[PDB]
Design a protein around this ligand. Sequence first.
Ligand SMILES: C[C@H](CCC(=O)O)[C@H]1CC[C@H]2[C@@H]3CC[C@@H]4C[C@H](O)CC[C@]4(C)[C@H]3CC[C@]12C
Ligand SMILES: C[C@H](CCC(=O)O)[C@H]1CC[C@H]2[C@@H]3CC[C@@H]4C[C@H](O)CC[C@]4(C)[C@H]3CC[C@]12C
Ligand SMILES: C[C@H](CCC(=O)O)[C@H]1CC[C@H]2[C@@H]3CC[C@@H]4C[C@H](O)CC[C@]4(C)[C@H]3CC[C@]12C
Ligand code: NA
Length: 315
Amino acid sequence: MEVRTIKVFTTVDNINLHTQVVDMSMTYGQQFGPTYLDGADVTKIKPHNSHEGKTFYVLPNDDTLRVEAFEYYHTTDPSFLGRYMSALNHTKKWKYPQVNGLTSIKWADNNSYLATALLTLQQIELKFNPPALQDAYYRARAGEAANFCALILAYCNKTVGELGDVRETMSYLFQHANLDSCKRVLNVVCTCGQQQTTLKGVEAVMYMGTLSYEQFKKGVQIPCTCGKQATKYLVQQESPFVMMSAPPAQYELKHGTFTCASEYTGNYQCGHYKHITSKETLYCIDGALLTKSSEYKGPITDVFYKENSYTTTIK
Ligand SMILES: C[C@H](CCC(=O)O)[C@H]1CC[C@H]2[C@@H]3CC[C@@H]4C[C@H](O)CC[C@]4(C)[C@H]3CC[C@]12C
Ligand SMILES: C[C@H](CCC(=O)O)[C@H]1CC[C@H]2[C@@H]3CC[C@@H]4C[C@H](O)CC[C@]4(C)[C@H]3CC[C@]12C
Ligand SMILES: C[C@H](CCC(=O)O)[C@H]1CC[C@H]2[C@@H]3CC[C@@H]4C[C@H](O)CC[C@]4(C)[C@H]3CC[C@]12C
Ligand code: NA
């Protein structure tokens, strides 16, 4: 019945802080709308003794807080934060082992496709532009990837334990990186004329249909029997990596010719990714798990290869 307040801080970036005076009769709800402490919803938990001086993430309710979230996260999605928080709240009790000098995640909540994305992020050259991703990535490379993993989940709109694709995942991660200088040129072969595309940005590091890069630049028969069934070949690449992608098929991975690749077992209704990286030998990372051999054969879905500048000569 006596008035008893604490002092806390709100935030949508965890950096710019904001002094509030909070009442211990009233929920966090009734003051700041939805409020989170480290992933946990306090929207209902009344202001405790132990919460004084501590930072609560809120929802961009005012305008300053719109400006901060935008500048931090590059998105105005009405539920982004809550999506971050729900997921932060799982991913902080995930473990993140050093495996062969890279940060991976231990299997939890069907994070297989995340472990593999993470391991790929750390072997390819790419710069995120959302400060939020720059910070969390930096921490992730340091083995505290909890923040990082909750954001991916946030930015791809997957919730913890939800069915997950690596190709799409990385699309979403490509959207928010700087991949401008990225240029690809393509032409079509065989009867009936000949018509050229040249792709840019994400569209220029990503190809669906074949895992083999060499097979891209030699050509592929593609669905396009316009009268002979045409072949697709790369003419120019300008990009620091490339990402080839197909339906899961059995594929042999040859030391020293690619950088890293993604394997998948199961159907479209459950399954598991592993990651294969090419060092002094071939390393197969499965969450906390690490095997090796000289050769690999298996169900491959995406492969990554080192790039700078290829110009065709094939015609
Ligand atoms: C890396 C991503 C783009 C790819 C690149 O830059 O290579 C990022 C970086 C800069 C970002 C955009 C900046 C603000 C924009 C305001 C507009 O009112 C709507 C959002 C707007 C388009 C953002 C979203 C996409 C961007 C997130
Ligand atoms: C919705 C479910 C998915 C969950 C799960 O995969 O555990 C079930 C319902 C019907 C099932 C399909 C029925 C036909 C086939 C039978 C064969 O024994 C296995 C493959 C087969 C294509 C099934 C795949 C799994 C399905 C789609
Ligand atoms: C001018 C470029 C070299 C720049 C440099 O010296 O840093 C050229 C010359 C040698 C080429 C590489 C050889 C084929 C490889 C295929 C593999 O699937 C992945 C690409 C791979 C590594 C190519 C990258 C582009 C290269 C074309
Ligand atoms: Na290269």
